[PDB]
Structure formats: structure tokens, C-alpha cells
Amino acid sequence: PLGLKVTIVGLYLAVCVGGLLGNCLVMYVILRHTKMKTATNIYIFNLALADTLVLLTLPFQGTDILLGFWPFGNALCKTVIAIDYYNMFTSTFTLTAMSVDRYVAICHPTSSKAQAVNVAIWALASVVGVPVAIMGSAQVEDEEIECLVEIPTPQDYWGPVFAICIFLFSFIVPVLVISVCYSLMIRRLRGVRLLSGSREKDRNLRRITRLVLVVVAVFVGCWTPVQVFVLAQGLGVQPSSETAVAILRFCTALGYVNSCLNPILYAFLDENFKACFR
Amino acid sequence: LEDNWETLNDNLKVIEKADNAAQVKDALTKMRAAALDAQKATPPKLEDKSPDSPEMKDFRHGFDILVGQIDDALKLANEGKVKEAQAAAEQLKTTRNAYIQKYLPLGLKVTIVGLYLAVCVGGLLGNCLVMYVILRHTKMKTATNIYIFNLALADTLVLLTLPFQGTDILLGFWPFGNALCKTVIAIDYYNMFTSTFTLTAMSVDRYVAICHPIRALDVRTSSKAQAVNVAIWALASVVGVPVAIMGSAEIECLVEIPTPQDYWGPVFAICIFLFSFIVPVLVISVCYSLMIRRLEKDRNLRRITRLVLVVVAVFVGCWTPVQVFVLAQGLGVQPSSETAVAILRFCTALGYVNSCLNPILYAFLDENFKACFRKF
Numbered sequence: 245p246l247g248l249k250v251t252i253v254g255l256y257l258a259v260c261v262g263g264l265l266g267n268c269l270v271m272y273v274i275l276r277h278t279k280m281k282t283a284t285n286i287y288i289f290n291l292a293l294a295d296t297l298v299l300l301t302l303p304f305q306g307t308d309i310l311l312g313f314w315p316f317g318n319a320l321c322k323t324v325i326a327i328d329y330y331n332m333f334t335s336t337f338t339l340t341a342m343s344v345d346r347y348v349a350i351c352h353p354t355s356s357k358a359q360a361v362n363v364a365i366w367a368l369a370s371v372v373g374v375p376v377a378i379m380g381s382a383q384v385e386d387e388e389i390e391c392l393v394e395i396p397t398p399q400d401y402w403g404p405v406f407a408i409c410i411f412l413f414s415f416i417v418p419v420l421v422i423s424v425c426y427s428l429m430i431r432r433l434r435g436v437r438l439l440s441g442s443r444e445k446d447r448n449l450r451r452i453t454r455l456v457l458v459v460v461a462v463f464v465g466c467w468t469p470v471q472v473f474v475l476a477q478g479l480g481v482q483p484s485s486e487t488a489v490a491i492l493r494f495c496t497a498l499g500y501v502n503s504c505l506n507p508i509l510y511a512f513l514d515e516n517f518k519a520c521f522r
Numbered sequence: 523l524e525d526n527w528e529t530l531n532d533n534l535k536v537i538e539k540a541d542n543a544a545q546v547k548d549a550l551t552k553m554r555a556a557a558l559d560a561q562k563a564t565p566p567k568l569e570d571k572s573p574d575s576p577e578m579k580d581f582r583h584g585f586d587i588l589v590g591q592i593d594d595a596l597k598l599a600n601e602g603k604v605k606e607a608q609a610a611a612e613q614l615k616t617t618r619n620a621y622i623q624k625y626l627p628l629g630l631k632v633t634i635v636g637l638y639l640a641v642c643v644g645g646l647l648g649n650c651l652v653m654y655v656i657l658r659h660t661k662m663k664t665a666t667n668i669y670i671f672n673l674a675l676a677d678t679l680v681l682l683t684l685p686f687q688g689t690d691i692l693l694g695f696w697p698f699g700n701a702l703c704k705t706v707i708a709i710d711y712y713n714m715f716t717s718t719f720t721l722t723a724m725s726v727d728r729y730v731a732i733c734h735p736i737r738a739l740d741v742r743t744s745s746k747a748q749a750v751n752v753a754i755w756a757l758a759s760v761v762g763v764p765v766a767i768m769g770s771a772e773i774e775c776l777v778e779i780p781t782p783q784d785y786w787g788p789v790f791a792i793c794i795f796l797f798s799f800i801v802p803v804l805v806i807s808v809c810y811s812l813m814i815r816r817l818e819k820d821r822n823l824r825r826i827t828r829l830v831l832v833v834v835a836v837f838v839g840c841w842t843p844v845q846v847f848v849l850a851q852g853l854g855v856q857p858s859s860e861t862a863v864a865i866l867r868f869c870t871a872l873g874y875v876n877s878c879l880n881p882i883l884y885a886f887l888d889e890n891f892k893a894c895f896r897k898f
């Protein structure tokens with residue numbers, strides 16, 4: 245309703261301000277402040293960059309929720325939709341990369357290469373990003389103009405097709421790989437007390453590995469409700485009650501909250517980052 | 523006690539290996555003090571019994587008779603008859619195997635295995651029969667039946683493992699190696715997750731039919747239900763494959779918890795509990811609850827809805843005891859009595875009985891299925 249969406253928007257504004265502050269701060273620290281351009285941080289940079297982009301759209305999406313329509317035209321409609329998908333894909337793919345990086349460190353004890361991967365990650369993402377941007381538009385159909393992605397005819401076929409594919413390749417499979425990485429660490433680590441190197445430097449590996457795992461946990465936690473719902477919507481399951489809509493609005497919000505959460509996680513679970521703040 | 527037990531073995535083998543009376547008299551000494559420090563201890567098997575219960579009292583008695591022979595063996599050694607003191611060691615090894623060993627059944631596990639064999643045969647027959655009927659026999663590929671197909675498929679896989687698990691129970695170890703160990707563990711988890719997730723999907727499907735009778739026709743196409751099954755096996759693998767990797771194989775088939783176990787134990791224990799069982803069931807509850815408030819031949823809708831609910835009920839009924847126990851095991855609560863183990867073995871069995879139950883439910887509560895089973 246009128247007051248419950250004000251809640252949603254106020255929530256966005258909060259996420260927006262804190263998010264940009266946090267992520268921009270992170271990007272700065274890694275970029276110029278210090279030579280802490282490590283494999284993991286270059287991937288973290290990639291996450292912050294993505295979060296930044298999507299955070300910039302909350303002000304726009306926020307007004308659409310209030311007005312009940314899209315008053316920014318087509319150009320910005322396509323722009324927003326692209327980012328939204330770019331966000332999801334670059335996030336998971338980057339997390340996966342970070343996970344493999346971790347596993348390599350643990351079992352096989354450069355930033356340039358991590359930088360290369362980020363490129364490949366944005367290259368893969370665009371395979372869905374650009375296409376969706378083209379398909380997306382703001383179409384005054386009946387009653388109201390609105391921003392959305394157009395599903396080809398018949399929708400009863402392509403709906404499920406894109407619904408399933410995007411579910412698997414944007415979320416499940418990446419998460420699946422991530423699981424394998426950590427599972428393999430587990431079997432490797434067993435029997436490794438202060439082993440595989442020297443005491444002084446091991447805690448970092450453990451601490452940096454612990455970091456990557458929490459970020460993944462937190463991400464998966466924030467975007468799973470939305471992923472399933474969106475999946476269901478693709479199959480034709482549509483919400484038609486105030487409560488249904490509300491829950492959806494909040495789970496969509498809950499996902500966007502993930503963007504501003506990362507910086508705080510780095511602050512609490514990463515010594516180096518914890519130092520550059522205060 | 524497991525410590526003292528080995529302190530007795532090494533000092534029992536040092537005896538008849540010795541070439542000096544001093545090594546014997548010394549070994550018998552070490553061996554004696556251990557029998558006393560082990561007589562006071564308590565075996566795991568009887569950590570739930572009183573210090574004066576027959577089972578417990580007759581465990582400290584085994585250590586009396588034993589110690590008595592170690593005292594005797596020492597008199598021979600002191601009297602100078604050192605050679606026939608070694609002879610007394612072969613006499614001890616006997617006392618060790620008969621009285622105290624068992625404290626570290628045959629016919630009740632035969633029951634368990636025979637139970638598996640029964641569930642296995644009937645299960646496969648029932649489910650395979652179901653998959654056939656839906657697959658080829660008829661164009662009864664409805665949204666609900668495509669989900670039922672998914673359940674049967676899962677039941678089929680897990681049913682195939684009962685023959686294998688059944689022998690492990692008999693032999694008391696896993697004789698099939700690692701490859702099959704990993705394979706079996708995966709299925710077992712795949713089963714649990716695929717089952718609940720499918721039931722949830724079926725429940726939502728039902729709710730949609732009840733509340734959206736207009737848009738359900740286009741929505742509850744089998745093609746879409748087919749797509750869901752794919753997503754269900756995709757979600758399941760997020761735990762299935764990882765567990766397969768962690769799983770491996772006296773020697774036994776089990777999943778390895780990372781160090782420290784006192785932390786990760788509860789972590790996986792709680793997460794698997796919530797996401798494999800509770801949350802799915804929670805959603806299901808919402809679906810029916812919403813039907814309640816909302817509520818030609820709608821008899822089908824009612825009958826098909828009634829069906830889904832019974833299948834859920836029966837499933838939850840069969841897997842709740844195990845879910846809680848397994849949850850408790852994750853928190854460190856371990857069974858250490860014959861009764862404890864037995865109850866666990868049967869509750870684990872009870873779960874596997876659920877696999878063969880479904881086909882019968884369809885036969886009794888579904889007209890269409892009830893008709894084709896008459897054919898065969």
C-alpha cells in the first residue's frame with residue numbers, strides 16, 4: 245500500500261547511500277591507497293564495481309514503486325535492466341572465481357591474472373546482459389506504462405525456457421562449482437595442522453578462506469528467495485494478492501541489501517580492510 | 523578404557539615374545555595395573571546403565587577373573603618357573619576374548635535386512651509400475667503426475683541401495699569400496715531433498731488450481747511441471763555432489779565433517795535440518811492454509827488435493843524421527859546402547875519404507891492409477 249511502499253523506498257535510499265559509501269571506499273582502498281592488490285582483492289574490486297552500478301539504480305526503481313509506473317523512458321529502462329542482470333551474473337561468477345582461487349591456494353601453496361578473469365567475467369555476463377537490454381523496454385500496454393523484459397511468443401514455451409536457463413546458469417551452477425571447491429579443500433585440509441607451509445602465514449589463508457565463504461553464504465542467503473520466485477513467475481505462477489506482492493517487494497529488496505552488506509563483511513573479517521577504515 | 527585395553531594387549535604380546543624373566547614379570551605387572559584401571563571405567567555400550575546393573579556388574583567381573591590369572595601368572599614367575607608363566611599368557615588371551623571383548627544383535631539385524639529386501643522388491647515394482655503408466659501407457663501426463671514421476675524416480679534410486687546397505691548392516695563394514703560409497707551417500711541425500719522439494723512443488727501446484735482455476739489450465743501444463751523437476755534436481759545437487767565428495771570409506775561408509783567438528787557439526791546439522799525438511803514443510807503448510815481460507819466435477823480437485831496431502835503426511839511421518847535423531851547426532855548426542863542403536867536402525871528403516879508406500883497410496887486414493895493397476 246501507500247505506507248508500506250514508502251518503507252520499501254526509504255529502505256532503498258538507506259541501502260543506496262551506505263552501499264555507495266561502503267563500496268566506493270573499498271574500491272579506493274584497493275585501487276590507489278595501497279599495494280594490497282592481491283588476487284582476492286581484485287575479485288573483491290569486481291564485486292564492489294558491480295554493487296556500485298546496481299546501487300545507482302535504486303533511486304530510479306524507488307520512484308517507479310511510488311508512482312506505479314516508469315517515468316524515465318526507454319533508454320534508462322534498458323540501462324537499468326542490463327545492470328540488474330549484469331549484477332547477478334558478475335556477482336556469482338566472481339564468487340566462483342574467488343572460490344577456485346582459494347582452493348588453488350590451499351592445495352597448490354598474481355593480480356594481473358585475477359584482473360584477466362574479471363574481464364572474462366564481464367564478457368560472459370554480457371552474453372545475457374546485452375540481449376536482455378535489447379529485449380527490455382517500457383511499454384504502455386493497458387492502463388499504465390511500465391519497464392520490463394519482453395518474452396517472445398508463445399510465452400508459455402519461452403517463459404519456462406528462459407526461466408529455467410537463467411536459474412541454472414546465473415545461480416545454481418556457479419554455486420554448485422563453489423561447493424565443489426570447498427568440499428575439496430575439506431578433504432585436503434584434514435590432517436593439516438600448521439601444515440602446508442609455515443605457521444606465520446597460514447592463519448591468513450584460513451582467514452581469507454573464511455572470508456570468501458561468508459560472502460558467498462550471505463549472497464546466496466539474500467538472493468535465493470528472489471531466484472525461486474522469479475523462477476516461479478516464469479512458469480506462470482503469478483502473485484495476485486496484497487500480501488503476495490508485499491513479500492515479493494521485500495525479497496527483491498532483501499537482495500538489493502546484499503550490495504551494501506559486503507563492505508561491512510570485509511571490515512569485520514579482513515584485517516587489512518579493518519585497518520584502512522578506523 | 524579403549525586406552526587401557528591396548529595397554530593390556532601390548533603387555534600381553536611382550537610376554538610370550540620376551541626372552542627374559544624380567545620382561546615377563548614386568549609385562550605382567552603393567553598388564554595387571556591396567557586390568558584394575560579398566561575395571562573401574564565404563565564401556566560406551568553401557569554408559570546409560572547403573573554401576574550395579576547386571577550388564578555392568580558382569581563387566582567388572584570379567585576383570586576380576588582376569589586379574590586373578592595375572593596374579594597367578596606372577597607367582598609362577600617369582601617361584602622361578604618363568605617358562606610356564608608365558609603359558610599362562612595364552613590362558614589370558616582366552617579370558618580377554620570371551621568375557622570382556624563383547625563389551626566394546628545378530629537376529630535383530632536379520633530382521634532389518636529382511637525388511638529392506640521386502641521394501642526393495644515391492645518398492646521397485648510399485649514405482650517402476652507408476653513411472654511406466656505415466657510415461658508411455660497413457661496421456662495422463664498431468665502437472666501432478668509429472669511430479670509424482672519425480673518422486674518415483676527418486677524412490678527408485680534409493681531403493682536400489684537397500685541391498686547394499688543391507689549387507690553393510692550384516693557384515694558390520696563396507697565391502698564395496700569408495701566409488702559405491704560416494705554413489706550411495708549422494709543418492710541418499712538426493713532422495714531427501716528431491717522428495718521434499720517435489721512435495722512442495724506439488725502443494726503449490728494444488729493451491730494454484732484451487733485459487734486460480736481460470737489461469738491454472740495454461741499454467742499447469744506438464745511441460746512446466748517438467749521444468750520444475752529439473753530445477754528440483756538442480757537445487758538438490760547443491761548438496762548432493764558436495765556430500766558425495768566429502769563421503770568415503772574395520773572400514774565404513776560415512777561423511778567426513780571438517781575440523782573442528784564441534785563447530786561444523788552443528789552448522790551442517792542445523793542447516794540440513796532447516797533446508798531439507800523444515801522450510802519445505804513450512805511452505806507446504808502455507809499452501810494448504812491458504813486453500814482453507816479460500817475454500818461440475820471439482821471432486822477431482824478435491825480428490826487430487828486430498829491425495830497430495832496424504833503423501834506429505836505419510837512422508838513427514840516416516841522421516842521425522844530420523845531427522846531429529848540425525849540432528850541430535852550432529853550436536854554430539856551419540857547413542858551408546860544396544861537399544862539406542864536398535865531404535866535408530868528401525869527409524870532409519872522406517873524412512874526407507876516410505877519409498878515403497880507411495881505407489882500404494884496412489885492406488886487407493888487416485889482413480890486413474892487405481893484403474894491401470896487393475897490392468898496389471
Ligand SMILES: O=C(NCCCN1CCC2(CC1)OCc1ccccc12)[C@H]1CCCN1Cc1ccccc1
Binds near residue numbers: 325328496
Ligand atoms: O522488476 C523490476 N525491478 C526489480 C528487479 C529485480 N531483479 C529481477 C531480475 C533478477 C534480479 C532481481 O531476478 C532474478 C535474476 C537471475 C539472474 C539475473 C538477474 C535476476 C522493475 C520495476 C522497477 C524497475 N524495474 C526493473 C526491472 C524490470 C525488468 C527486469 C528486471 C528489472
Ligand SMILES: O=C(NCCCN1CCC2(CC1)OCc1ccccc12)[C@H]1CCCN1Cc1ccccc1
Binds near residue numbers: 714795844873
Ligand atoms: O548410515 C548408513 N545408512 C543410513 C543412511 C540414513 N540416512 C542418513 C542421512 C539422511 C537420510 C537417511 O538422514 C538425515 C538427512 C537430512 C537431509 C538429507 C538426507 C538425510 C550407512 C551404514 C550402512 C549403509 N550406509 C549408507 C550411508 C552412509 C553414509 C551416509 C548416508 C548413507
Ligand SMILES: CCCCCCCC/C=C\CCCCCCCC(=O)O
Binds near residue numbers: 253316317
Ligand atoms: C525515491 C525518490 C522518490 C522520488 C519521487 C518521484 C516524483 C515523481 C513525480 C512526478 C512524476 C510524474 C511523471 C509523469 C510522466 C509520465 C509520462 C512519462 O513518464 O514519459
